[PDB]
Amino acid sequence: KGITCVMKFGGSSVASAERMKEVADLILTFPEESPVIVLSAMGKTTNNLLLAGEKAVSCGVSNASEIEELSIIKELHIRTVKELNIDPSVILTYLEELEQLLKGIAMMKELTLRTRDYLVSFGECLSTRIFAAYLNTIGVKARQYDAFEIGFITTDDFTNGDILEATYPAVAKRLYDDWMHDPAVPIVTGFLGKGWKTGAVTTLGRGGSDLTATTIGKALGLKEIQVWKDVDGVLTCDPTIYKRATPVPYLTFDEAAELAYFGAQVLHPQSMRPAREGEIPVRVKNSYNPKAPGTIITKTRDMTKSILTSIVLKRNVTMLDIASTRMLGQVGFLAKVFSIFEELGISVDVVATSEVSISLTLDPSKLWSRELIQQELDHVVEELEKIAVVNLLKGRAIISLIGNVQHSSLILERAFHVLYTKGVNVQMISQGASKVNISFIVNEAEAEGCVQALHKSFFESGDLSELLIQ
C-alpha cells in the first residue's frame, strides 16, 4: 500500500533528546501507519542562528568563535548526540561548517538575505540528521532528507521562497522511488527549498515547516496532513491567558486562516493552500494525548451547533489615526497613505475608516524580528503629517471574535453587553464582507480581563440557543 500521512513537528517537540524520544514513541504508537516526518530545528536554534548572524556582523574576526549563540547551538547538539548515543562525526562536521560561516560573516561585516537563508538551514539540517540516526539506533529503518536536495523548487527571493509548481511531481517521484526500492521512514527538513535560478538554499517564509508538510501531502496524494502540538488542538482561547480554554473539534480551512496563526502558533494561511487545493484535511494533534481526535480542518463542517468558535488576543499593538477633511470624495488618499508605509517597510494589520479619517494597527511585533524603535515611528508620523492630522497610540490590544457569521448580531449583542458590564469601550472595530473574524481594539491592560469575561459568556454559559425559530 505504501506511504499514509505526513507528521510535522515544531521546535519544542524536538528541543532535546528527551523530547525527541517522545516523537519516536509517537511513530511507534501507530505501526499500522507509514508516515513522512517533517522536522523543524531543535527548539530555538533557528532564532539562535539568526542572532549569531547579526552578532557576527559587528563582533570582530578574532572572536566569532566566542559568539554565545554559537556555543549554545554547539553544545545543544553535541549533548543531544551523547544522550541519544549517535555517531557524532556527521554532526561535528556540520557544526564546524557553521563556525566557519560565522567567521565569514564576521570578516566581511555583511549579511545578505541569501546568506541568512543558508545560516538558518543548518538548523533543520542538524535536526533531521540527529533524529534519523536515532531511529536507526532503536530499530526504526529511517532516511533523512534535505528538502532542497529532493524536489523542493522555489523562487530566488530568500527570506520568502515561493514554492513552484514543478515541486509536486519532483518530490513525489523522488520519495516514491526510494520507498519502493527499500522502505524507510522519511525524515524531511522544515522550511527549506532549492530555488530555480541560483540553486542556493532557500527558506519557505511564513508558515515554514507547516508548508513543507502540506506540500508533501498534496505531492503524494495522502489521506491527511497532521500538525503536532502540546495541547488538544485549536482551543477556544489561549490557555496562557485563561485556564479554561476548551478544544475546538472542527474548523473550516476558512476559519483556520482567520484563527490558527494568531490563536495557535501554527498553520499560517499560506501553508494551508496546498491542502486546500489537494482537498486533504489537516489535523492538529496533542503529543500528550495522541489517540485523541484533536482538531480537523476541512473545506466544510456541520454549523448547526455553531455560535462562537474562538477568541484571539493580539498584545501590545501600536495604533495610528489619520484624519483629513480632504479625504471625503477625493481619489488617491488611501493610495498615498499606504504608499508611505510601503516606502518605510512597515506592514499594517487592522484598518477601519470614518468620513474624514482612516485608522491603523501595525503588525504585532511577535510577527517580526524586533519592535519598531522611536525613530521609525517618528518617521511615519512626519511623513503622514504632510497630508493629515496624525495621532499615534502605543500599548493597545486586539481581541478577535471568530464565529459563525450567520449569528453575527447574536454574537455582537452578547459581546458588547459583556464589555458594557465591565465599563469597557472598544476603541476601533473592523469586520470585512461577511468574514468570520471581527476585531476590537482595546487597551493592553484591560485585554486579558475582557478575554476571560467574553469566554465565560460564550463558552461557559451552557448551550447558546435562545435563537429565534418557530
Ligand X SMILES: C[S@@+](CC[C@H](N)C(=O)[O-])C[C@H]1O[C@@H](n2cnc3c(N)ncnc32)[C@H](O)[C@@H]1O
- Going by the annotation, the residues of the binding site are 8, 11, 40, 124, 330, 332, 347-349, 354, 369-370
Site for ligand LYS in 246-305 (CB under 6 A): none
Identity of the residue, 112 or 354, whose beta carbon is nearer to ligand LYS in the bound complex: 354
Residue 446 CB neighbour total at 10 angstroms: 15
Which residue shows C-alpha cell 544522550? 83
For residue 355, the minimal CB distance to ligand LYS (Å) is: 6
453: left (phi over 0), alpha (psi -120 to 50) or beta: alpha
Is 193:202 a contact under the CB 8 Å cutoff? Answer: yes
Site for ligand X in 348-367 (CB under 6 A): 362-363, 365
For residue 363, the minimal CB distance to ligand X (Å) is: 3
Spatial distance between the Cα atoms of 318 and 362, rounded to a whole number of angstroms: 6
Residue from 93, 100, 265, 339 touching its own copies (CB under 8 A): that is 339
**Residue 117 binding target from ligand X, ligand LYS, its own copies, none, CB below 5 to 8 Å by type:** none
Is 236:21 a contact under the CB 8 Å cutoff? Answer: no
Site for its own copies in 306-325 (CB under 8 A): 319-321, 325
For residue 349, the minimal CB distance to ligand X (Å) is: 7
Site for ligand LYS in 113-142 (CB under 6 A): 123-124
The amino acid occupying position 345 is: G
Burial 379-408 (b: 16+ CB within 10 A, else e): bbeebbeeebebeebeebbbbbbbbbeebb
Residue 108 CB neighbour total at 10 angstroms: 13
Residue from 17, 23, 46, 283 touching ligand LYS (CB under 6 A): that is 46
User: Does 372 help bind ligand X (rule: CB under 6 A)?
Assistant: yes
Residue from 1, 181, 370, 386 touching ligand X (CB under 6 A): that is 370
Spatial distance between the Cα atoms of 302 and 277, rounded to a whole number of angstroms: 21
For residue 278, the minimal CB distance to ligand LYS (Å) is: 19
Cell of 37: 516526518
Which residue shows C-alpha cell 481594539? 441
Interacting residues with ligand X (CB under 6 A): 331, 345-347, 362-363, 365, 368-372, 376
Interacting residues with ligand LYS (CB under 6 A): 10-11, 40-41, 46, 123-124, 190-191, 208-210, 327, 330-334, 341, 347-349, 353, 358
